[PDB]
Amino acid sequence: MLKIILPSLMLLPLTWLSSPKKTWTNVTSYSFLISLTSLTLLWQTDENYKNFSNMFSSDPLSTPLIILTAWLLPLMLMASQNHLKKDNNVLQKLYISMLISLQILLIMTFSATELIMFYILFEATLIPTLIIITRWGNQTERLNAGIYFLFYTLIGSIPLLIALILIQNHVGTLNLMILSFTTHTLDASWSNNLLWLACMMAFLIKMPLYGVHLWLPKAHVEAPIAGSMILAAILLKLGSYGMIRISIILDPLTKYMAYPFILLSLWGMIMTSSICLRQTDLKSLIAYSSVSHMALVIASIMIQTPWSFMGATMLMIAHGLTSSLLFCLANSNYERIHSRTMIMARGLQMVFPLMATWWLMASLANLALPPSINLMGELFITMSLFSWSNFTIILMGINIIITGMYSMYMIITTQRGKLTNHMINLQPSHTRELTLMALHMIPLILLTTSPKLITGLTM
Amino acid sequence: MMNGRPGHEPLKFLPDEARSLPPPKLNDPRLVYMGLLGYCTGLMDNMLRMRPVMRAGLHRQLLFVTSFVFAGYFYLKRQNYLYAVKDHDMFGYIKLHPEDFPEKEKKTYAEILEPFHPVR
Amino acid sequence: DGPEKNYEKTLAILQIESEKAELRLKEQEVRRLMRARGDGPWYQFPTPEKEFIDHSPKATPDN
Amino acid sequence: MPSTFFNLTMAFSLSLLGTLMFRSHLMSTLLCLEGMVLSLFIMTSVTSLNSNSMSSMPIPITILVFAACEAAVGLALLVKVSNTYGTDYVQNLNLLQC
Amino acid sequence: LDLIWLEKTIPKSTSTLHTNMTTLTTNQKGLIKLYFMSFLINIILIIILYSINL
Amino acid sequence: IRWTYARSANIYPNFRPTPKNSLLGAVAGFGPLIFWYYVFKTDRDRKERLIQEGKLDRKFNISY
Amino acid sequence: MNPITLAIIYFTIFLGPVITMSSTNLMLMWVGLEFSLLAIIPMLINKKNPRSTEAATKYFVTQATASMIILLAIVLNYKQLGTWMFQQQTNGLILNMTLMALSMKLGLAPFHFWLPEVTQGIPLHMGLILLTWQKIAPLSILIQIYPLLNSTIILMLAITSIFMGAWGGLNQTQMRKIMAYSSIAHMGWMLAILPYNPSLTLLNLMIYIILTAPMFMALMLNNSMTINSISLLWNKTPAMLTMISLMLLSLGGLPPLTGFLPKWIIITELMKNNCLIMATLMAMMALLNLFFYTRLIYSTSLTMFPTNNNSKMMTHQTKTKPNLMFSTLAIMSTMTLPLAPQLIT
Amino acid sequence: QLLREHWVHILVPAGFVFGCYLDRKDDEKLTAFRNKSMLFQRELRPNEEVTWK
Amino acid sequence: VKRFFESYHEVPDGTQCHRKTYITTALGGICGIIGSAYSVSLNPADSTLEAVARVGRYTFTAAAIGAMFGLTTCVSAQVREKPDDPLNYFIGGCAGGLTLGARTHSYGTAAMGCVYMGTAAALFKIGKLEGWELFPTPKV
Ligand SMILES: CCCCCCCCCCCCCCCCCC(=O)OC[C@H](COP(=O)([O-])OCC[N+](C)(C)C)OC(=O)CCCCCCCCCCCCCCCCC
Ligand SMILES: CCCCCCCCCCCCCCCCCC(=O)OC[C@H](COP(=O)(O)OCCN)OC(=O)CCCCCCCCCCCCCCCCC
Ligand SMILES: CCCCCCCCCCCCCCCCCC(=O)OC[C@H](COP(=O)(O)OCCN)OC(=O)CCCCCCCCCCCCCCCCC
């Protein structure tokens, strides 16, 4: 794991020592090489998990998240290159440093084998996202968005810290593999119910429920493109990863203690898809779509079926890729027009043909299309939920119908129709942003071609 | 909590029993990180005084790194002594009071009946 | 290298973590017993010193 | 001796109540402080004389020295307060609340 | 829901509670007579707590 | 711009709690949750009772 | 001033806590406390403004009353046992009076009301000297009587100090009052962990001191008094901003800054002693502390408040920042979390 | 120092080499149960020092 | 009064509702007296009559909160026959919060008091059920 962490650590001296005319080139190229290096722990021949160190470990669950983070860092650099062109060199290098530190801390978080170290790196990732959102956001409400994001996360995470220290004082180790082996059943008391709530609510805040979710649209609207990318593609999945990790020591009482959150997830995915239907902001629409998909992930992890876990992992990776792609496309239009109003730019398929192709493919990934890991994850989540109770299929069907409706509504209202001819400042395309869309979409095709990698722990 | 132990000479940084312990290898992550902190201290001092960040004050940066490594080495040796003597006192107390720390026999997974909770 | 290297490394890591957990529980029990009845090296609260008691004969015999 | 020590403890309690309950006069507060000091001196002297602790007999002299030092500092601060305002009123010195 | 009532329930109500409580806490005048009266009340409460718990 | 601002950032500054909207928010935020709670709870209790009494058989359900 | 009386006053300021922490007689601890108070008063009233006079008066009467209660406790102990130290079998009333009076010396709630008042209206270096150096001698006396303390009164004082400090720092806009309420909250944490581990309150005291020394140094550099005054720091000293933000986050207790370590280890020890309710409440109010720190960070670092015309002349001139003191303490107070087993003792 | 100028291109490769070295050092650090597992526990071969390095 | 607050728990819930209501009302009255003393010390009234009025108002408000809490908790334990259950204490704490809101004349204060005080009372019932040691003597 150190062979991946240390080059990413040395990215920062490269960033601060590179010439100002070569900084973006050097950091982007070496971060691509670091992702290529991070591809090496897919070499999983045996069923044994790759335990490199006494503190670092690999997993069929942790590996796709690490590879996605290492892949997404150069994509964030490419996306954030254009909107920092009229900026001080020190500020540009500081922004690149924030992105690189996010990548380092997230790789360490996913590869950490101890829950307390996972918590430390969890809040360590909480810091530079706040700095990015507040310092480089565009509108006034970035400060409110940062406050909401930070303190939703912290009020979630403090009972998680209390619960982790309780578990460490009880069993003596707080190591994931020792807990997984000598896990102990809980005697179903009110203290154990509160312990379950304390160790769940941090991750239930971090990936959005129907309740606490109000920080996500604010942060996504007010964040720059790299911040939206890192949030919607890694941090919600970080909450899901934490839930999958910590659910193993709560064996007997999850089967009744998970009831309110399953209902909250299903009805909330319906309501957030409805908001996507009647939403006037493109980034808000993508954010609420992310809430709906993560609600599906919450329901699968709560019902704790092998099909549910596999579908949860597939939906995690697929949703990260397609949400980053949608955010990048919306950011390209926003860099053209300097407004996120959805109804204002309408006939963009006329002037941007292949960007419209990327829009069409991104929306076909957003809805569940059967040659895609999106439909793979959503379909196996549906199968596990219907096994859990047959009446969940009604909520699933309503969610799928509204999902198709808001995705095709997005395509029709922002690409098709008569072109708003008054918008003179529609530059043709940047090879950079077309490359950005291609680097989002081609991994979706490859993971569709071989979905055994995205299958998680259970099979 | 360990200040009242027998043989505790007061305000002694490193007693002779610490001489029984292996010292840090002088290139271990604690001391390398201490040197890195000293280097970052020098760089931050240059940036705050509005000098070139690394081109200026090489003697200051050298003194910072050297002092951080020196103090970190001696403090690390003291902490190794403290942890070692804590483990020694704990093991001695265990050996002194065996009736309060029974060697509990665990049985195999063939007599214990763990309840099974199906996840239908 | 092969599956045996990762297998044995995992076994060594598990042994280290299990011994550390056992020692942490032992440390908790030892500290609790010592503070409950201070008889080991730890939690030795002080006491007025013997070496400042005057044992010389006094002006009054009844001392 | 226990009755007298109870009376001295109650005298200290009364002087403490006087110190805590202000009546418009920093000088009266300092007077209550020195009443507390006098009560402590009498308590220490009576205890040392009863226990024949001639080795601990310098303790009342030490507390008297440090008490007069603090009374000196309080009188100097009262002089500065009077130079600032001219009335020496604890309710008049109140402008640090904001 | 998402623009009125979840907002009114969790974050805005928490912020309103804490700003009301910080106004109530920092509503002090700079009168050391009042401060020492409060200190006397603290001493009385500590004495009563000792006499009750014992 | 005015339409977008009125639809987005003006609603909570111009929201006033009334008993009507309090009742509406309570029913719209809790009634579906309680309804689907009782639906799933009754269905799962019936399924668990059938499995425990043996009247429900999994014919070829191997992977759930 | 005058160098001779500067030497006398500063030596007595040093000598007070040294006598208190190195003396085994309660009387000599009390005369050390008296030394500290009487020596620090002329350093407080030095600018000879009405605010300085008021702050000196308030500080004097508060510390004099608290020291008189301390001396009452010492004399009552001497009456009961004949010794000059609370050995093991003293009266709980005597011990509770000692704790209450030392709490009023320290300045934690509900005895906290004078501390933002005194810290306001006093120059920044004297506020630093107060909020760091004056809190070691009463803490030394409290550590000396490590058992035989009332855990109930300790936990009540700790929880109310953390609550009131969080609320006060949330309300205040004056930087010195913000620092005073931060002091109240951190003293609440130290007092909370006091009866279970003296090492952890010593560690939290050291972390707090090395965290708020460079905060006061950075305030002292530009003589910044208010939130607006610290907000126009991007024009005055733009290199300060990252260290200011990191130290404010470390005071908030965010991982992976080393200010997370004292709260983390105190919560760990309280879990070991089964005080989950107190630990949870303390952690939530620490989140409130982090909120007012983060508002400060928004003002000074992550946004750029408007500046005025004369800051051009300020940029024309040259400055001076203390070597070996600011940068060293800032680095050791931000990036020393992986040395946590070495820091705990 | 014959090439000079853009010297910074060895920083990330140096970090990668050092990371591989640290992984090798951790493998040498663990070293327990070299052939002591119940699963493999094979003979040491006529010409072989250790099973894995 | 330590034996008084222990005599609160000498009988199980749903028994001696009058005794439990009286004990909780006394506890609330003590808390209101302490709070009123702090209020009239820190923020003085314009005259002694207003000070006495504020003390009486605060004491009666806290006594009403305690009385309604104890009464509703014991009534719930009576009407559904399971005393060791935290939902009775949650209902009672919500009733106490509603009493607070009625005294303060604010439905928002009523709702927030209901939620917070019900959570606190349920946590207290769980603590008394499963032996949570508030203010523990140092052991480790
Ligand atoms: C962001 C989400 C916030 C809301 C949900 C948070 C979780 C809700 C349920 C858990 C209770 C509250 C958190 C407790 C954390 C520790 C849990 C734990 O260790 O439990 C086992 C412990 C019990 O320890 P135990 O299990 O060792 O008990 C001994 C048991 N025997 C004897 C059988 C071995 O639970 C507690 O101690 C709970 C005490 C809580 C006291 C503080 C409550 C504060 C207020 C509650 C809400 C706080 C968050 C919201 C703040 C406001 C936000 C707007
Ligand atoms: C793992 C975590 C990932 C997280 C995100 C990572 C992003 C960065 C990625 C960097 C590169 C990693 C690539 C990972 C995928 C590799 C795909 C691959 O080569 O898979 C192997 C597969 C043959 O392997 P095999 O064992 O036969 O497959 C399983 C059979 N039991 O090979 C093949 O089958 C050949 C594949 C290449 C040949 C071209 C395929 C063209 C497919 C056209 C599809 C058209 C329809 C698309 C419809 C889309 C609708 C939305
Ligand atoms: C359905 C699910 C239910 C379960 C989950 C419940 C919990 C969900 C998570 C918590 C809720 C979100 C909290 C964070 C967001 C709210 C805070 C906020 O944004 O406050 C803003 C406001 C200041 O506004 P400002 O921007 O300064 O003003 C305009 C320009 N000056 O700020 C203020 O006015 C003051 C803000 C104070 C700081 C708030 C955050 C800290 C909260 C501490 C909690 C303490 C708990 C214990 C309390 C005592 C015991 C009851």
User: Per-domain residue ranges for chain H?
Assistant: 1-51
Q: Do F11 and E5 make contact, defined as CB atoms within 8 angstroms?
A: no
| I135 Ramachandran zone, left/alpha/beta (phi>0; psi -120 to 50) | left
> Kind and range of the H or E element at A457?
none
- Which tokens in the block code for residue H16? 């990668």
CA of A162 to the centre of ligand 1 (A): 8
Q: Decide: B17 and B5 in contact? Cβ < 8 Å.
A: no
Residues in contact with ligand 3 by the CB-under-6-Å rule are A 144, 147-148, 151-152, 155, 211-212; E 10-11, 14-15, 18-19; G 284, 287-288, 291; I 116
CB within 8 A of B55, min separation 6: which ones? none
A304: left (phi over 0), alpha (psi -120 to 50) or beta: left
Give the number of domains in chain G: 1
In angstroms, the CA A379 to CA A385 distance is 10
Run of H or E residues at I54? helix I48-79
What span, in angstroms and rounded, lies between the C-alpha atoms of A417 and A412? 7
Residues of I with CB below 8 A from E36's CB?
none
Contact A20, A89 (CB under 8 A): yes
Burial G54-75 (b: 16+ CB within 10 A, else e): bbbbbbbbbbbbbbbbbbbbbb
Q: Which atom of ligand 1 lies nearest, measured to the CA of A189? A: 33
Assigned token pair, G208? 């707090």
Q: Could you tell me if G232 and G305 are in contact, meaning their C-beta atoms sit under 8 angstroms apart?
A: yes
All residues at 6 or more sequence positions from A156 whose CB lies less than 8 Å from its CB, including other chains: A201, A202, A203, A204, A205, A206, A212
The values of phi and psi at residue A451, to 5°, are: -85, 10
Nearest one of G190, G198, G96 to G135, comparing CA atoms: G190
To the nearest whole angstrom, how far is the Cα of E23 from the nearest Cα of chain D? 13
CA distance A183 to A181: 6
Give the separation between CA A84 and CA A68, rounded to whole angstroms: 24
Q: How far apart are CA G68 and CA D71, in angstroms?
A: 12
Range of the domain at D47: 2-98
CA G183/CA G129 separation, integer angstroms = 12
Of E51, I132, A171, D40, which is closest to residue G68 (Cα–Cα)? D40
Residue pair A207/A290 in contact (Cβ under 8 Å)? The answer is no
Contact indicator for G119, G179 with CB cutoff of 8 Å: yes
CA atoms of D73 and G218, how far apart (whole Å)? 32
C27 touches chain A (CB under 8 A): no
Atom of ligand 1 nearest to the CA of A162: 16
CB contact under 8 A, A173 and C24: yes
Q: Could you tell me which residues come within 8 angstroms of residue A272 by beta carbon, excluding any fewer than 6 positions away? A: A210, A213, A288, A289, A291, A292, A295
Spell out the residues 6+ positions from residue G65 whose beta carbon is closer than 8 angstroms to its own: D16, D19, D20, D33, E36, E39, G104
Q: Which of A172, A168, A149 is nearest to A160 (CA)?
A: A168
Inter-chain residue contact I139 with C28, CB threshold 8 Å: no
Contacts of C8 in chain H (CB under 8 A): 30, 32-34, 36-37, 40, 52
Summarize chain H as % helix, strand, coil (round to 5). 45, 0, 55
Contact between D39 and D8 (Cβ < 8 Å): yes
B113 belongs to a structural domain = no
Nearest to G78 by CA among D50, D38, D12, D3: D50
Give the DSSP per-residue string, D47-69.
HHHHHT-TTSTHHHHHHHHHHHH
* CA dist list (Å): D55 to A70, A226, B31, G76, G77: 76, 76, 53, 18, 17
How many whole angstroms from its chain centre is CA A155?
20
Distance A159 CA to ligand 1 centre (A): 7
* Cα(A318)–Cα(A311) distance, integer angstroms: 10
Q: Which two tokens stand for residue B40?
A: 């970052």
Is E30 in contact with G121 (CB distance < 8 Å)?
no
Chain C nearest-CA distance from I90, in A, is 36
Compute the 3-state secondary structure of chain A and give helix, strand, coil in percent, each to the nearest 5. Answer: 75, 0, 25
Contacts of D2 by beta carbon, 8 Å cutoff, 6+ apart: none
Q: Are A282 and A228 in contact (CB under 8 A)?
A: no
**Measured distance CA(C20)–CA(A416) in Å, rounded:** 64
Checking chain A for breaks where C and the next N are over 2.5 Å apart, the residues before them are none
Between CA B32 and CA B24 the distance in angstroms is 11
How many domains, in total, are found in chain D?
Answer: 1
The span from the CA of G47 to the CA of B109, in Å, is 78
Torsions phi, psi of G105, nearest 5? -65, -45
Structure-block tokens of residue A324: 């980053």
Nearest residue to G16 (alpha-carbon basis) of G143, G100, G145, G130? G130
How many separate domains does chain B show? 1
Contact A417, A351 (CB under 8 A): no
Nearest CA in chain C to I138: C35
**In which region does residue A81 sit, left (phi positive, over 0), alpha (psi from -120 to 50) or beta (all else)?**
alpha
Top residue of C20, C42, C45 to mutate, by most chain G CBs within 10 Å, is C45
In sequence order, what are the residues at sequence separation of 6 or more whose Cβ sits closer than 8 angstroms to the Cβ of residue C58? none
Asked if A447 and A318 touch (Cβ cutoff 8 Å), the reply is yes
Q: Are G72 and G132 in contact (CB under 8 A)?
A: no
Residue F63 is given by DSSP the state -
In Å, how far are A72, A279, A285, A402 from A271, measured between CA atoms?
30, 12, 12, 10
* Structural contact between residues D66 and G97, judged by C-beta atoms closer than 8 angstroms: no
Contacts of H50 (CB under 8 A, 6+ apart): H34
Cis peptide before G110 (omega within 30 of 0): yes
Chains in contact with D, counting 3 or more C-beta pairs less than 8 Å apart as contact: E, G
User: What gap in Å lies between CA B71 and CA B75, rounded to an integer?
Assistant: 6
Residue G256: cis peptide before it, omega within 30 degrees of 0: yes
Residues for chain D: how many in total? 98
CB atoms near residue A385 (< 10 Å): 27
Helical packing angle, A23-38 and A62-81, nearest 10°:
170
In order, the DSSP letters of F13-56 are: TT----HHHHHHHHHHHHHHHHHHHHHHHHHHHHHHHHHHHT--
Three state DSSP letters for A84-108: HCCCCHHHHHHHHHHHHHHHHHHHH
User: Do residues G98 and G153 touch, judged by C-beta distance below 8 A?
Assistant: no
Nearest to E43 by CA among A292, D16, D52: D16
| Structure tokens given for A227 | 């911040």
Q: Spell out which residues line ligand 1, taking CB within 6 angstroms.
A: A 155-156, 159, 162-163, 166, 191, 194-195, 197-198, 201, 205; E 10, 14; G 276-277, 280-281, 284; I 119, 123, 130-132
Distance from CA of I126 to the nearest CA of A (A): 7
- CB G18: neighbour CB atoms within 10 A? 16
From CA G234, how far away is CA I42, in angstroms rounded? Answer: 40
Determine what percent of chain D falls in helix, strand and coil, rounding each to the nearest 5: 75, 0, 25
CB G300 within 8 A of CB G242: no
State the burial class of residue G127 (Cβ atoms within 10 Å of its Cβ: 0-12, 13-18, 19+): buried
Q: Ligand 2 test: best mutation among A103, A446, A447, most atoms within 8 Å of CB? A: A446
For residue E29, give every residue at least 6 positions away whose Cβ sits within 8 Å of its Cβ, in sequence order, or none: D94, D97, I43
DSSP reduced 3-state for C53: coil
3-state SS assignment for residue A112: strand
CA-to-CA distance for C26 and C11, rounded, in angstroms?
Answer: 23
**Interior CA angle at E30 toward E27 and E35, to 5°?**
85
Cα(G68)–Cα(G302) distance, integer angstroms:
48
For residue I8, give the nearest of I128, I130, I108 by alpha carbon. I128
The response to whether residue A450 sits with its C-beta less than 6 Å from ligand 2 reads: yes
Q: What is the DSSP secondary-structure string of G1-47?
A: --HHHHHHHHHHHHHHHHHHHH--SHHHHHHHHHHHHHHHHHHHTTS
CB within 8 Å of G258: residues ≥ 6 apart = G207, G250, G332, G333, G334, G335, G336, G337, G340, G343
Task: List CB contacts (< 8 A) between H41 and chain C.
Answer: none
| CA–CA separation, A194 and I129 (whole Å) | 14
Which is the closest atom of ligand 1 to the Cα of A198? 7
Count the residues in chain C. 63
Does A121 touch chain G if contact means CB atoms closer than 8 Å? yes
Residue A112, beta-bridge partner list: A56
Residue A168: C-alpha distances to residues A116, A186, G269 (Å): 9, 15, 12
Kindly tell me the burial class for residue F13, based on how many C-beta atoms sit within 10 Å of its own C-beta (0-12, 13-18, 19 or more): exposed
Count of the separate structural domains present in chain A: 1
Name the packing angle between helices G241-252 and G198-222 (round to 10°).
150
Nearest CA to ligand 3 atom 50: G281
Is residue B119 in some structural domain? no
Cα(A420)–Cα(A426) distance, rounded to whole angstroms?
A: 11
Q: Which residue has the tokens 């005025």?
A: G308
- Asked whether the beta carbons of residue H52 and residue C11 sit closer than 8 angstroms, the reply is no
Distance set, CA A227 to CA A106, A132, A234 (Å): 14, 7, 11
Please name every residue paired with A114 in a beta bridge, in sequence order, or none if there are none.
A175
Residue G97: CB atoms within 10 Å: 22
Q: In whole angstroms, what is the distance from residue G255 CA to residue G250 CA? A: 8
CB C13 within 8 A of CB H30: yes
Q: Which of H16, H18, H20, H24 is most worth mutating to test chain A (most A CB atoms within 10 A of its CB)?
A: H16
d(CA I95, CA I72): 7
Ligand 2 proximity of A443 Cβ (cutoff 6 Å): yes
Identify which of A223, A232, A113, A222 has the alpha carbon closest to the alpha carbon of residue A173: A113
The tokens for A422 are 């008054």
Chain H residues with beta carbon closer than 8 angstroms to that of C1: 52-53
One-letter identity of residue G325: M
In sequence order, what are the residues at sequence separation of 6 or more whose Cβ sits closer than 8 angstroms to the Cβ of residue E3?
A: F11, F12, F15
Close Cβ partners of B53 (under 8 Å, ≥ 6 residues apart): B43, B46, B47
Chain A neighbors of E12, CB-CB under 8 A: none
Residues making up chain E, counted from first to last? 54
Q: Which helix (H) or strand (E) holds I50?
A: helix I48-79
Listed in sequence order, the residues at least 6 apart from G7 whose beta carbon sits closer than 8 Å to its beta carbon are none
Residue G266 token pair: 């105190």
Structure tokens at A389: 């109770």
Q: Is A264 exposed, middle or buried (0-12, 13-18, 19+ CB in 10 A)?
A: buried
Identify the DSSP state of I4. H
Which residue has its alpha carbon closest to ligand 3 atom 33?
Answer: E15
- CA of residue A194 to ligand 1 center, whole Å: 5
Q: What is the largest CA-CA distance in chain B?
A: 73
Phi, psi of A389 (to 5 degrees): -155, 135
Handedness of CA E42, E44, E45, E50 (dihedral sign): positive
How many CA within 13 A on the CB side of residue G285?
Answer: 26
Instruction: Round to the nearest angstrom and report the end-to-end CA distance of chain A.
Output: 24
Interface-testing mutation among A214, A218, A270, with chain E (most E C-beta atoms within 10 A): A214
Ligand 3 pocket: which of E1, E2, E14 to mutate (most atoms within 8 A of CB): E14
Distance CA B38, CA G343 (A): 17
Chain I interface, mutation test: which of A165, A168, A187, A191, most I Cβ atoms within 10 Å?
A: A191
